[PDB]
Structures are given as C-alpha cells and as structure tokens.
Write a protein that binds this ligand. Structure first.
Ligand SMILES: CC(=O)N[C@@H]1[C@@H](O)[C@H](O[C@@H]2O[C@H](CO)[C@H](O)[C@H](O)[C@H]2O)[C@@H](CO)O[C@@H]1O
Ligand SMILES: CC(=O)N[C@@H]1[C@@H](O)[C@H](O[C@@H]2O[C@H](CO)[C@H](O)[C@H](O)[C@H]2O)[C@@H](CO)O[C@H]1O
Ligand SMILES: O=c1ccn([C@@H]2O[C@H](COP(=O)(O)OP(=O)(O)O)[C@@H](O)[C@H]2O)c(=O)[nH]1
Ligand SMILES: O=c1ccn([C@@H]2O[C@H](COP(=O)(O)OP(=O)(O)O)[C@@H](O)[C@H]2O)c(=O)[nH]1
Ligand SMILES: [Mn+2]
Ligand SMILES: [Mn+2]
Lengths: 243, 245
C-alpha cells in the first residue's frame, strides 16, 4: 500500500559525478519503496553509472539521452525521457500508487522530505533552500492550509514560483496528462517548473508540506569544480582508475 | 567490531545544516560509529545539537572556538581536531585494550560506505587514495611488492614525510592514546605539511597499512561546496532569519 516514489535524476559525466551519485545513493538507501530513475546525458549508458547503480542494490531504471548541441535549461531532455518512460511503463488508469520527484544529483535531501511527499494526492510543495538568490523560497500558505502565492524575489509572477526540488506529483496525474512535458523550445529562464505544473494542477489544489511550508527539508547545494591543474597536458594519474 | 571515532570539525555558515545532513545520511549506515562533532564556536549551537540528537547516531558534541584573531597560516579545523584528540585521551585510559580507530572527516567531503570497513581493522595507521586533492584527480600512496608503502603518487611535494590528505588515513585508537603528545601543529610547518606533522610522531612509512585494494581504488572524495548566492536577500533581508536552514 506504501506508494512508490519515482526519483527522476538527470546526470552527466564530469569529475564529481561518482561522488555526487554516491552520497545521493547513500541517502536513497534509507527510503523504502523507492524507484531511482537515473537518466544519463550521454549517447549511451556509461559503465561508471551502471556499476554504481548495480552495486547499491537499489531499485533503479538506467536510461540515457544526449542534450542537443545548444548546451534551454539543464536536464530537460533527460527529465522528459523519464516522463515518457513512466507513461510507457504504467497504464493511464493504473492502480499501483506512485509519486514522481525530480531530484538533481547535486542537491541535498533530508529523509523527512521523502516521508512528506509520499502521501501526495495531486501535487505537493515545500520550501527549498538556496534558490532564487535567497536563503530559501517558500510557497505562501494561509491559515486554512491552502497555497495562495509564493514567497520569492526572482520573477514572482511565474505560475509556479518554485524550484524543481520543491514539488512532487502523484503518478496518476502524470499518466492522465500524457502529453505534458517540460518545455525546452521557447522557454523563459525559470519557467521550466511552471511549463509542466500549469498543465497538471492549479494553485488551490497544491498540498503544502513541511509544516505548512515553514521548514526547510531540501537544499539546492552546488558542488565546486575540482582543480586538476597538476595533471598537466599529458596527465599524471592513471586514466583507467575511476573517480 | 572496532568502534570508528569520526572527528568532524564544523562551523556555522549557510550550507552547514545541509552538509551535516547528507554526511549523517552516510554515517547512519555505519555500525559501531561514534561521531565526534566539534563545533568551531564559543558554545554548542542549537542547530547542531538538535540535528545530532535527531539523527539517532552515537555522538559526542564538543566545541572550541578558533580565536577570531587566528582566522584574520592556520589550517581550517585544526583546533577542533586537536580538541577531539585531547578528549579521546582524557576519556579512554592509555591501557584498556579497547578496539577503536580514529578518522578525521571534514564535513564537506564525500565518503563511501566501503571506506569505513577498510579503515575499521587498522592496527597502526592505514592509508588510501583520495580524489580531488593536490591538484590531481586523486593522490595515492605507492606500495611495493612486499605490501609496504614506499612513497606517494602526487605532484605537490611527493617527498614529504606523508604526502596524503586528512581524509586519506585513519589511526588505531590505542596508538593515539600511547602517543599522548601527538597533536596537529598550529604554526611552524610549511603549507600542506600538517598531516605529516602528526603522522611523523605516530608511525613510520614501513608501518603504514595500505587499503582500498592496495591503493588502486578511490573510496573518498575531497568534494567542496559552492557558496550559495543570497543577493536577493538585500541589506535588510527578505526571508525570515528565525527559519533554520
Ligand atoms: C595546485 C596545487 O599543487 N595545490 C597545492 C595544494 O594541494 C596544497 O594543499 C595541501 O594538499 C595536500 C595534498 O596531499 C593536502 O590536501 C593538504 O591538506 C593541503 O594543505 C598546498 C599546500 O600549501 O599547496 C598547493 O596549494
Ligand atoms: C539571483 C537570481 O535572481 N538568480 C536567478 C535564478 O534564480 C533563476 O533561476 C531559476 O530560479 C528558480 C527559483 O525558483 C528555479 O530554481 C529555476 O529552476 C531556475 O532556473 C534564473 C532564471 O534563468 O535567473 C537568475 O537571475
Ligand atoms: O549538461 C548537463 C548539465 C546538468 N545535467 C544534470 O541536470 C541537473 C541540473 O543541475 P545542474 O546544472 O547543477 O543544475 P543547477 O544547480 O545549475 O540548477 C543535475 O542532475 C545534473 O547532473 C545534465 O544531465 N547535463
Ligand atoms: O572557520 C572554519 C573553516 C572550516 N572548518 C571545518 O574544518 C574542516 C576544513 O574544511 P574546509 O576549509 O572545507 O576545508 P578545505 O576543503 O579547504 O580543505 C571542515 O570540516 C570545516 O567544517 C571550521 O571548523 N572552521
Ligand atoms: Mn544543481
Ligand atoms: Mn573541505
């Protein structure tokens, strides 16, 4: 009966990738009924990602799709591939409860976050730290427990002024709205979340989590680029040793 | 199953809670682990105290403020690591045959679960490769056919006593207790020689124990976290300062 949480994680090859996937997997290993949908931004599945997923024992699906020359946001085509995979895997009126969460590989997630999104009926929302040039963004909730706006500074007029890591969607809505995908073509920066949510739910139907959006359970952390200046042009370390 | 005493210096800054949260999520998987969190502050902060209590991990919350004056060449977290060393020596009798290992783990690095099992059996001092240090993809101890460390594969001062990062070694607790005068140096050592300053008083190259498949695998990464952009907070502030992040 416990709903399955489908975590959609776009990822790409770069120095810190294995470290990012490692601490993220260490977090996900604590969550029951979790399906990790990892979509690599590559022409084919890489052995690094394949072996890491295999060794964790986690329930996962490993997909891949390469981003076009112009590299629109980041991770878009990968999240869209995952949405299509879900629709091809689960029938529109499926009865198996599920929740979909788009979790980037560098963010920091608390275990409480997953407990909060698991009961999502339509779309749930919560505060996100380190987004929109603020300590955190948070949906505005009235005393009745309804979402009536957003507490942000960056373009507060977007239909859904919230970051990718700030909401989850019941799988049923994703299957019913079979044509709803993240916009990549004519897309204003910061409107990717709205491009999808607008087609799935209305403001008044959002389900505020994290004690009526007063607590921060997820952080939009960024990882610094490692300095590899000492490798030189010919390289110093063994290129066959995986990092 | 030997207890692993993880020494983690930490300080108040925007990403602190996040760093401790994802680190706790990793540590929660490790059995017989004692987390020695040492805050760089005048007193234990409610944020850290609450987080440690909520994790369910076995921990000891200590604190020592690095003089404001000092921060204005003293390696980050030095005084905090030394406070933990002193605490271990004042808590555990020099002789008791208590199986344990000490590991200095900074709050922003990335650790694999396999790393802890590799260091848990340490008899003296164990060493292993560390990614993203010394301007390289990784630094790795060099081992000979006899199974002994005979040098270090690095570009930055590979000829120093111990050319290895803080996250690349662990010390048997008994050894820490025996060498009661061994602490990280505060001043007098060249940049990048603090790890050597301590290790040289603890062991010789020949007594090192190579881990991580004879130092051929990377099980720990010296990752660093970017500073969050808070420009939209303005001068007077936008978000509620009472809301913990
Ligand atoms: C580009 C470069 O060579 N950088 C080096 C630093 O790596 C070095 O910092 C030390 O590096 C060692 C590596 O084993 C440890 O990580 C140690 O903790 C670091 O202090 C500094 C030393 O002053 O020199 C250059 O910056
Ligand atoms: C300092 C500042 O205002 N920066 C903004 C970015 O925040 C913004 O990025 C978008 O931010 C929203 C926040 O809810 C969300 O994280 C989106 O995913 C993200 O794209 C960017 C838009 O291109 O403009 C900057 O100026
Ligand atoms: O070419 C790229 C750049 C990013 N990503 C992934 O898509 C998400 C976008 O995150 P990143 O740019 O950190 O996002 P930011 O922090 O800039 O919002 C993360 O899971 C990345 O691993 C990707 O697949 N391909
Ligand atoms: O004023 C400070 C700066 C850092 N630290 C801690 O000491 C370690 C040093 O790390 P940081 O500078 O990242 O180290 P670097 O990546 O520069 O080696 C980390 O556990 C920090 O939380 C601290 O206690 N006080
Ligand atoms: Mn990111
Ligand atoms: Mn660090």
């Amino acid at each position: 009966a416990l709903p399955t949480i489908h975590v959609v994680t776009p990822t790409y090859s770069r120095p810190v990738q294995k470290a990012e996937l490692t601490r993220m997997a260490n977090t996900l290993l604590h969550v029951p009924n979790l399906h990790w949908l990892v979509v690599e931004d590559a022409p084919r599945r890489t052995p690094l990602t394949a072996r890491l997923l295999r060794d964790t024992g986690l329930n996962y699906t490993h997909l891949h799709v390469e981003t076009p020359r112009n590299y629109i946001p980041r991770g878009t085509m990968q999240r869209n591939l995952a949405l299509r995979w879900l629709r091809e895997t689960f029938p529109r009126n499926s009865s198996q409860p599920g929740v979909v969460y788009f979790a980037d590989d560098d963010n920091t997630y608390s275990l409480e976050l997953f407990e909060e999104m698991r009961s999502t009926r339509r779309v749930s929302v919560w505060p996100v730290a380190f987004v929109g040039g603020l300590r955190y963004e948070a949906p505005r909730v009235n005393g009745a427990g309804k979402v009536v706006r957003w507490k942000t500074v960056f373009d507060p007029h977007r239909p859904f002024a919230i970051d990718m890591a700030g909401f989850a969607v019941n799988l049923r809505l994703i299957l019913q709205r079979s044509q709803a995908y993240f916009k990549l073509r004519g897309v204003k920066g910061g409107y990717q979340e709205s491009s999808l949510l607008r087609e799935l739910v209305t403001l008044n139907d959002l389900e505020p989590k994290a004690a009526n959006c007063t607590k921060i359970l997820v952080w939009h952390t960024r990882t610094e680029k490692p300095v590899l200046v000492n490798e030189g042009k010919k390289g110093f370390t063994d290129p066959s040793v995986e990092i």
